[PDB]
Structure 1
Amino acid sequence: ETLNPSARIMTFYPTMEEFRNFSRYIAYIESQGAHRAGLAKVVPPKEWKPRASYDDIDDLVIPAPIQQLVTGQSGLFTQYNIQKKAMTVREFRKIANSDKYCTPRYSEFEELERKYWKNLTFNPPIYGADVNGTLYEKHVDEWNIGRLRTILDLVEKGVNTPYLYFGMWKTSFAWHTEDMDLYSINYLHFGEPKSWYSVPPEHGKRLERLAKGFFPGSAQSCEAFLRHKMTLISPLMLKKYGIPFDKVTQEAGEFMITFPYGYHAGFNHGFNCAESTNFATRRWIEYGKQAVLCSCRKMVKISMDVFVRKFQPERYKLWKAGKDNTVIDHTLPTPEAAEFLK
C-alpha cells in the first residue's frame, strides 16, 4: 500500500536488457505499484521495432468493420455496433482520412477530448476492430504479442491470439475489464494517438455500482453488463459521482498494459493501428476464479481447474467444494515480483 498510494498511471522506459524478459518486466512494474492504477505505459527502447515498415498492408482484409452508433446525453452513452462488409486497409485509410471522418483541428488534447465528448453521438465512425492477426515480423522475440510466453499458454484445447484494431477519429472502446479479468497488452503500431481512461481496480466496484444505477434494465438482464462493451461514461460524470480515475494518451510505438479488474475506456485520435492480446501472471489466477461473467451470451469463459491444480495445489479440494472465501488484495503485487521487492 506504500508503493503508488495515489494509484496514478505510471510510465516505464526499460533498457534493452530489462525489456528482453516480458513476464519478468511485468513482475518489476508491479513491484513499483503500477497495477494499482489498473493501467500502465511501457515505452520500448529506441533500437526496438517489431516490423521494418508497414507499407505492405493495403490489401490486408478487415473482415468485420463496425460502424459505431452512440446514443446518449450528459456523459452517459450506449454504443451500438453495425457490422459492415469486409474492407481492406487501403479502403479503411481513405475513409479515415477523408473530409467527413478526419481528426478535427485542435491545439491541445484537452480540446480534442472536449470535441470527442461533444460529438461522439454524431457522424458514426467505422472501427476496423477485432482483426485476427499480427504485424510483428516472425524473428521478433521481445514482447511479441503473438507469442508472449506467459502462464496463460496452459489453455491448450481466442484469449491467446493477437487482434488488430484499425482506428479512425472518434472510434471508441467502452468501459470494461478484460475477459476473465485477465491482463492485456496493447501496442500502437502506427498512426494517431489513442487516449485511455482508467479506474484503479480497488475502486472498480464503485464504477460498477454507478453503471448499475444508470442502466437498471441492462443490470437485471446480465450479471456483468459492462462486459458487452457498450457503455460510455465521460470523465465529468465520473468526477460528479466521485469515481477515482486517471487518463493517459498512448502514442505510436508505445505499449499499454491493463491489469486484472482494471476498468478502461478510450478513443482514437485518427487513423491508426493497435495490436492486442490477453495475458496472465500467477496473481491473475485468483481474479479468474472470482470473475463475474456475462450470463446473457453463449462469451469467453476459461476453466480455472488446470491453474488451481498447478499453482494452488493445497487449495484445489477447498475451492472445488465452493468453500474458498479468499478476499483479493488489489494493492498486492504478483508473487514473481519478490526478487524486485527484496
Structure 2
Amino acid sequence: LNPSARIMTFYPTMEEFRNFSRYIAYIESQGAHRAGLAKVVPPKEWKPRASYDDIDDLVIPAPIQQLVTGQSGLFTQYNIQKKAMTVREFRKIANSDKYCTPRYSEFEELERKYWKNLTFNPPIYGADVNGTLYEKHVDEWNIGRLRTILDLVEKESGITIEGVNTPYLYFGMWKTSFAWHTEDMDLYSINYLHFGEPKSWYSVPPEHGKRLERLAKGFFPGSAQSCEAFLRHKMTLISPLMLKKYGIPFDKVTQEAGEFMITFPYGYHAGFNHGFNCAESTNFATRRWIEYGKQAVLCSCRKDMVKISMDVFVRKFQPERYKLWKAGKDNTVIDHTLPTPEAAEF
C-alpha cells in the first residue's frame, strides 16, 4: 500500500470525479496519503472557468516582498508588505526583465538556480487573496464548496477563517516561495493551478514528519526555544540537499496549469513558483483528520493564531471517547498509514 511513500498521480474519469469526498477516500485506499502530497489531473473536459481575460482589474490588497536570509541550504524568509496592486500590474512586474524566469534546459537546472539565487533580488508574491476563480455554476471540485466535514465549523459556530474554510488566490512570479509547513490544525489542503508557469513542490511523508521537526529544531535552535511549532510561522526554508544530507526522506513534484494537488494531514510541504501564475487554495477534512486535529501541536507564541475547536467533531464522530478526551485522557496514537474510514467501500 504505497510502501515507499512515493508521490502519486491520478486521472479520474469525469464520474469518478464528481464526488469529491469519495475521490479522496479512493486515493487514500490506494496509498496516496503516505507521501503527504498527491496530484490529480482532472478529466480533460472539466473546466472551472471559461476564460481569464477578464481579471486584469482584480485587486491584490496586500502583496508581500519576500526577503530571504541564510546560507548552506538553511534560510529564513521575511515578509515585506507592499502596496495594493491589480493583477495586470503584478503581471507587468512578473514579466519584466527584472523579475522573470531565467532560461533553462531541464527542471533540475531551474531548481539549482532557485536554490542558488533565492536570497537575491527579492520577489513579490500576490499571496493570500480572498476570492475564487470558479464559475459559480461549476459543481465538481469547487474550492468554494467541497462539502466536507470541515463545514461543521462554519455551520455550528458561524466561524469563518480566511484561507482555511474560505478560498485564497495566490499570484506567483519566478522565485516566490512557500516555506516548510503542515496545514493549520493539520488539515488537508487543495491547490488548483488556474494558469501560468508551474509550481514545484517538495514533500516529506507524514510518518517521518517528526524527523523533520527534530531536525529543524537543531538547525534553528533559537526559534525552537521561543515556539514549539515555529515551522507554523511559514518562514523556514530548507533545501533538498540538506534534507538528503541528514537522511530525511522527501519527494519532489511539479504541478502544471490545470492540475490539482492535495496535501494530507501532517504532510510537510514546500516549494516555489516558476513564473507568472495563479493558484487557488483552501483546507478540508475527512473523518480521519479529527484525530490529527486533536493532537496538532500549535503555535505557542501567537504569531499563528488559527485554532479550531475540536469539540463539535469529537462529540459527533467519537461519542464514546468524548468524556475521556474532555477530561484530557484520550491517548490514541495516530497511525499515519491508515486510509480514512470512508474508504471501506473500495
TM-score bracket for the superposition, by shorter chain length: over 0.9
Q: Is structure 2 residue 324 aligned with structure 1 residue 326?
A: no
Secondary structure at the counterpart of residue 151 of structure 2: helix
Offset at residue 223 of structure 1 (A): 1.1
Describe the superposition over 1:28-51 as per-residue Cα deviations: whole angstroms up to 9, x where unpaired: 000000000000000000100100
Describe the superposition over 1:141-172 as per-residue Cα deviations: whole angstroms up to 9, x where unpaired: 00000000000000026511000000000000
Offset at residue 201 of structure 1 (A): 0.2
Normalising to structure 1: TM-score of the pair? 0.98
Separation in 2, partners of 1:9, 1:72: 29
Offset at residue 234 of structure 1 (A): 0.2
Secondary structure at the counterpart of residue 288 of structure 1: helix
Describe the superposition over 1:250-294 as per-residue Cα deviations: whole angstroms up to 9, x where unpaired: 000000000000000000000000000000000000000000000
Separation in 2, partners of 1:306, 1:135: 31
Match of 1:282?
287
Separation in 2, partners of 1:215, 1:105: 34
Separation in 2, partners of 1:294, 1:63: 26
Separation in 2, partners of 1:207, 1:230: 15
Offset at residue 135 of structure 1 (A): 0.2
Offset at residue 297 of structure 1 (A): 1.3
Q: 2:12 aligns with which of 14, 25, 36?
A: 14
Secondary structure at the counterpart of residue 156 of structure 1: helix
Match of 1:51?
49
Offset at residue 295 of structure 1 (A): 1.1
Offset at residue 111 of structure 1 (A): 0.2
Match of 1:171?
176
Match of 1:98?
96
Offset at residue 18 of structure 1 (A): 0.1
What aligned pairs does 1:153-168 form with structure 2 within 5 A after superposition?
Answer: 153-156=151-154, 158-168=163-173
Separation in 1, partners of 2:137, 2:7: 31
Match of 2:236?
231
Describe the superposition over 1:31-72 as per-residue Cα deviations: whole angstroms up to 9, x where unpaired: 000000000000000100100000100110001000000001
Secondary structure at the counterpart of residue 309 of structure 2: coil
Separation in 1, partners of 2:332, 2:114: 41
Offset at residue 302 of structure 1 (A): 0.1
Match of 1:188?
193
Match of 1:116?
114
Offset at residue 107 of structure 1 (A): 0.8
Normalising to structure 2: TM-score of the pair? 0.97
| % identical aligned pairs | 100
Describe the superposition over 1:87-128 as per-residue Cα deviations: whole angstroms up to 9, x where unpaired: 000000000000000000001100000000000000000000
Q: 1:151 aligns with which of 130, 144, 149?
A: 149
Secondary structure at the counterpart of residue 209 of structure 2: helix
Separation in 2, partners of 1:63, 1:207: 34
Secondary structure at the counterpart of residue 345 of structure 2: helix
Separation in 1, partners of 2:335, 2:45: 38
Separation in 2, partners of 1:312, 1:324: 11
Separation in 2, partners of 1:313, 1:60: 46
Separation in 2, partners of 1:136, 1:24: 21
Match of 2:314?
308
Q: Which runs of 5+ in 2 are unaligned?
A: 156-162
